[PDB]
Amino acid sequence: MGKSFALLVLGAIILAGGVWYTIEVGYSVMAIVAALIMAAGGGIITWGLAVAADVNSPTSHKI
Amino acid sequence: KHFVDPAWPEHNPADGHVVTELISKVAGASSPWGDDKEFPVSAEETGYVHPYTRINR
Amino acid sequence: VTTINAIWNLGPYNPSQVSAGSQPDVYMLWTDGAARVMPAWELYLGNYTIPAVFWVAVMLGILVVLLVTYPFIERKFTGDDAHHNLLQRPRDVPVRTSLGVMALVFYILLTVSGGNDVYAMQFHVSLNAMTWIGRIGLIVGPAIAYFITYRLCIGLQRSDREVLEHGIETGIIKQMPNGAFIEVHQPLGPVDDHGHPIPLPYAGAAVPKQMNQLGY
Amino acid sequence: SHTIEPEIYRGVSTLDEPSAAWGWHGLKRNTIQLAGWISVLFMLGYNFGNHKGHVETIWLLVITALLVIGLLIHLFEPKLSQVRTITSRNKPVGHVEPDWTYDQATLTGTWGNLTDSQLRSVNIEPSRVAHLRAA
C-alpha cells in the first residue's frame, strides 16, 4: 500500500480542517475558500483509495 | 453525327454510358485526370524542369 | 462612387469643439494609437517636467530607426554580406518572415487602437477593454504571431520536401490484391529500381503540388 | 532506399528545419529570454498607472504568471523519461510482429498447424492444403 495510507492520513487532516473553517466563516465569500480546502481533502482521500484500488490488481508491470 | 469530347472514354455501346446520375464504374469520385489514364509516367513526360540553383556564399 | 472627406459636414475649425470618432487618416492611425496605449508616465523634475507623450515620440522614433537599419542588423546576425541577385521565398527564411509578421501585428494593433472608439461603438466592446487590449496585446500578440508564423514557415518548407522526395500525390487511391490501399504518386525526377524516386535537391524554387499544375 | 544525410548551418540542423541553408533560421535562446523578460517587465510596469479598477490588475498578473512560468520552463528545459512498463497484452520492445493477413492468405506462419476440423471451419477442404503444408 504505502503512500495510500499516507495520502489517507494527510487528506483527513485537510478535510477536517476545512470542516472546521466552513463553520467559522460562515456564509461570506471565504466560505467558498473553505469548500475548496474540503474538496482538496476529499480529493487526496480518493487519491489514496485509488492507489489502493490499483495495487489490489495491477494492470501493468514495472518492466 | 453528334459530338463527343476528345477526353471522353470509349466504351461498349451495349453497356449504356460511362457515367449516369444513378451509377458509375467506380466506388469513389472519378478522377479529374481521366480514369483511362494510368499513372505514374516518366518525369520526362511531365515537363517539369527541375531548376539548378546556386546562390553566392 | 464613394465619399472620402465630406468637409461640409464637419464645419469650420473652432478650438472649443470636438467630435467623438475624430481620428486621423489611416496611414497616421498608428501614431494616434501609440498616443492612446502609452500610460501616464510623466516626470516632474523640480521646476521642469517631461510629459508622458515624450515616450510616444521615443517609441515611434525607435520603430522608425529600426526600420531604416534592418539590412545592417541582418548582416550582423546572419553573418552574410554576399552579393545577391536571386530572391528568397519567404518560407525559406523563417526568422525574417516571423519578425516581419509580428511587426505587422504590432503595426495593425497600433492602427486598430488608434481607431478603437469607433471599434467599440460599432462592435460594442468596452473602450477601457480596448485600450487594455492595445497595451497587453502589443506584447503578447507579436509573440504569438512569431510562434505561429515560424511553425507555418517550417511546415510549408517540409511540404516541399515531401513532394521532392515522393512526388505529387495524384489523389488516386488504388487497392492491391493483398488488400493494401496505396495512393499513386507521380515522381518529378528519375526513379530507383524499386519504384521509389531518387529524391531531387531543393532548388529554392516552387515545387508543383497537384497534377493540374503539370497540365493533366 | 536512399536518403541524404543532414547538415548544420550556423547551429541549425537540416533535419529539424529543411531549408537551413537558404536563409536565417532559428534565432537563439538568450534572445528569446531577453525579449520575454523585457516584456515581463513592461507587463509589470502597466500596474503603475492612473487606473482605478483591478480587473485590469488580475489580467496583468495572470498573463505575467503565464509568461514567467513559460520562460522558466524554457530556461530550465524539463524532460521526462519514457515509461518502461508493460500493460495488458502488449509485448516488450524489440518483439517482431507477424503479418497475420499474409499468414491467413497462405495458411502459413501463425495460421500454420491447423487441424482438419479447423481447416473445414474456414471452408478449406483439407485435401487441397494437405498436399502443400504438413505433407
Add this chain to the structure above:
Amino acid sequence: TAVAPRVDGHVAPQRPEPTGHARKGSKAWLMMTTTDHKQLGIMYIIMSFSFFFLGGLMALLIRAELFTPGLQFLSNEQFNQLFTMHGTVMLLLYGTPIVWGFANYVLPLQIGAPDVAFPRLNAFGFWITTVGGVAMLTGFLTPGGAADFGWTMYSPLSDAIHSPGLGSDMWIVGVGATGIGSVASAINMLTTILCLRAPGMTMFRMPIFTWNIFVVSVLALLIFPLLLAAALGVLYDRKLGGHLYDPANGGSLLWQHLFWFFGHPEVYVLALPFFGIVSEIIPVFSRKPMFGYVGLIFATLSIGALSMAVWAHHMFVTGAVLLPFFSFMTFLISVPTGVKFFNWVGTMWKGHITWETPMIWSVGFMATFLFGGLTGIMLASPPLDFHLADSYFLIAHFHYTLFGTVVFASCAGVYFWFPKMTGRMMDERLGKIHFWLTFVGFHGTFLIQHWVGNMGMPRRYADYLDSDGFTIYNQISTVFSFLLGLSVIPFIWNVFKSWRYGELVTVDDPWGYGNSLEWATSCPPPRHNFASLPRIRSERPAFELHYPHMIERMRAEAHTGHHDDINAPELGTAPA
C-alpha cells in the same frame, strides 16, 4: 476459399512511427490543410475536450455561488449567463463534436475504407464547428455579456423586445454554425458507409458503433436543418421586425414545439454513439462476443424511429399538449433503450473479465446511466412531472444521464482507442485515479440534488432564502462539485505525458481480443489505414485473424438452440 502462394522475399510492411517523435513544423500547415479523416478526428476530440473544460468552469462558478444563501460574488444576470452558456457549450461544443470526432477517426477503420467519402467537406465541418464555438463565446466579450435565456431560448423571452443584447444574436449564429458542421459530418459518414465498405464487409458484419453512427447521422440530418430554420426565424424576427413568434400568434408554443422536435432527437444523437463505444469495449475485455447482435441493431433502429414521436414530453406542464399520446410514446422508447443493458449483461455473463481502464469506465457508465434512466421514466409520467418539471430533480436526471454517456463512455473511448490513435498506451494507475475521482465527485454532486429538487428547489435559481431549507444540500453538492472538477487534473496529465513518453505498442491489438477491424492494422494506422486486409466473415474479423483455433469453437457455441448443420452436406460445387 482460395489460398495464396508462399511468395518469396516476403517481409511484413513497415510500422508507422508513434507520437512524440515529431520535428518542428510537422503539423502546423498539415493541420491547416489536411483532409485526413484521422488527423481531423484527433483535432475534433482535442477541441471538444477544451470546450468541456470551459463549460465545466462555468458550472463550477455556478456551484460556488450556490454554496450559501446570499449573492457572494455573482449577480443575477451573470448567474443567468453562466447556466445558459454552460448548457450550450456542453451540449453543442463538447457533445456533438466529440461524437463526430470519434466517428471520423474509427469509422473508416471499422468498415475498411482508406478515406471518408468527401474529405474536404469533413475539413469544412471541423472548421465551421470551431467558428461556431468562437462566435458563441464571443458574447462574453461584450459589456452586457453572453446570452442569458437558458439553452432552450424560450420565447417571448428570446424576442428582441425582451432580450436585446448582442450576445443573444451571437448565441443563435453559434448554434447555427455548429449545426452546419454536424450536417456536413452526417453526410460524410452516411455516404462512407454506403459506398466504401471492404470486400465481405456486408451490412450485418459491421460493428455496432457503425450502426449507431448510421442511425444518428439520419437523425442529425432530420433535426439540424430544423433548428437552423427556427433560429434563423428568431433572428429574422429580432433584426427585421417580424412577428412569427409573437405571443398573440401562438409564438411561445410554436417555438417550444419546434425546439423540442429538434432537441430530444439531439439527446438521442448524443446517447447512441456512446452506447456503441461501450458495445465495442465490453466484449473485448470479457473475451466473449457481443450478445444479441441483430437484436441490438433492431433496438438501435427502433430508437431511431421512436425518437421523432416522443418530443413533447418536455411540454407537459404547458397545459397545451395531448398528455396520453406523448406519455405512452415515452414509455415505449424506454423499452429499446433498456434492452441494451440486458445485452451488455449477456455479453458479461460468465465471461473472463479483466479490469483495464476502459472496462472500468464502461461499467461505471452502466451503473451511472441506469439511475438516470430510472429517473427518466418518472418524468415520462405527467402526474409526477407536474411536480418534477423544472426542478433540481430534472437537473439530477439529465446530469446522471449525460455523464453516463457523453463523459464516462467518452473517457472509455479515449482510453480504449488511445493506443490505436497514437501508438502508445496510457498510465493505468493515473486512469484509475481519474475514474475514482470522477465517480466519487459525480455521485456526491448530483445524487443529493434529487432530494433538494423534490423538496421544492427550482432550476436556474441564482439565490435562495435560508428559510427554504435548501442550504445544507447545496453545500454538500458544491463540495463534491469541486472534487469532480479536480478529477480532470490527472486526466490532462495522463494524456500529455503518455502522448510523448508513454509505453510503446508493439502489437496490432494491445488489449489482445479486439473484435472490430481496427485491431487488424498497426498502431497507429498508416495514412490510408490498411497495409493489407483480412477475410471478413464474422462481425469480429480481427478476433478470427489472431485466434484461428477458436473459429471452430465459436461457430459451435454461437446459438443456444441445438443446431446441427455442422453435419450438413456440401453445397455448391467449385467457383468463387
Add this chain to the structure above:
Amino acid sequence: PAPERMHYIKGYVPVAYSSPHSSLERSATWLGMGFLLTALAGVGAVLFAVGANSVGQQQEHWVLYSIIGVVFAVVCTVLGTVLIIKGRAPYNRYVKETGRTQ
C-alpha cells in the same frame, strides 16, 4: 446476376445474415417491422380509453376510442405479421432444401 447458393463444404458453417435468401433484405420484412412497431399505439389507445373511463371521464367517446384502438392494433399486427412471413418465405424454403440453417 450472382448464383442462388454459394460453395459450402461439409463442416463449414457461416455467419450468413446478408445472404441472398435472408429476409433481412427482402423489403417485406422491414415494412412488417414498421407495422408491428405501429400496432402498439392501438394498445396505447385502448388503455387510455379504459383508464379514462375507470375514473369517470371521456364519457362521450371512450367506446369509440376503444374500438379504433383495438381495430388499429389488430390490423397493424396482422398485416405486419403476414408481411414478416412473406419476407421469411425464401429462408424457410432454403432451410427445407438443405440441412443448413445458419
Add this chain to the structure above:
Amino acid sequence: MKSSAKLMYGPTVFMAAMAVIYIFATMHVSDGGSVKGVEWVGSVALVLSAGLTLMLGVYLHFTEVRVDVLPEDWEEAEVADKAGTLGFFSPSSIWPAAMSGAVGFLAFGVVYFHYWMIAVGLMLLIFTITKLNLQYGVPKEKH
C-alpha cells in the same frame, strides 16, 4: 446496398402512422390539460420527416435495382475482388478553412447587422466555395 435501402421503410411507415394518429388525435380528443385543435407544428414536422426517410429509401432502392453484385455486398468475397482503382480523393485543401472564415465573417455581420459585413461575407463565401470547386482544374500557367 439492399439492406440499407430496405431498412428505411421501417421508420417511414412508423412516422407516417404517427403523423396521421397525432393529427386526428389532436383535433378530436379533449382532455383538461390542453385545448382541442390540430397542432400544426408536429403535423408538418412528422409528415416531412417521413418525407425525408421516404426520399432516401426510394432513391437508394431505385439505385440498388441496377447496381451489380458487389464484393462488399457478398458473403464470401475474396480480398482481391476490389483490386484496382477505388476512386479519387482530395489529398489536401486550404479552402475548407477559408470557407469557415467566410461564414464566420458573414455570421458576425448578421449579428451586428452591418450591411457591408453581410455583403463582404456573401462575396467571400461564393468566392471560397468557387475556389474549392475549381481546385483540381486550375490551368497550367502559359508563360
